[PDB]
């Protein structure tokens, strides 16, 4: 107690949603795309390190 500290990194799959954004096609046709991405923490140590402070 008071010497060791524990950081809890979730192993459940995280869901990341992207807001509406504009994309340019090959014919300069502007499009409106709504998309989401889903990822999971693979290396809890590295993720915590890379994303310093384990902040989603």
């Amino acid at each position: 107690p008071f010497i060791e500290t524990v950081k809890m990194l979730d192993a459940r799959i995280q869901t990341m949603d992207n807001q509406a954004d504009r994309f340019v096609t090959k014919e300069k046709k502007d499009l409106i795309v709504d998309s989401y991405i889903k990822w999971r923490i693979s290396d809890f140590s590295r993720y915590y390190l890379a994303t310093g402070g384990g902040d989603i």
Binding site: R22, V24, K28, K29, D30
Partner: protein, 52 residues
């Protein structure tokens, strides 16, 4: 080809400096045209629809 050149060119720019910063990724975000000319860009598409 730009994200490859700008990433490579940026690295060459900081080679003489010798700084300890390391480049991880160069991810292009947006290339939207000027808002003033956006109006015409969409009209050109509407003209095709009007033609039909």
């Amino acid at each position: 080809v730009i994200r490859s050149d700008t990433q490579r060119e940026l690295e060459e720019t900081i080679r003489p400096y010798d700084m300890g910063i390391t480049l991880l990724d160069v991810n292009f975000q947006a290339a939207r045209p000027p808002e003033e000319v956006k109006a015409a860009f969409d009209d050109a598409i509407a003209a095709r629809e009007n033609e039909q």
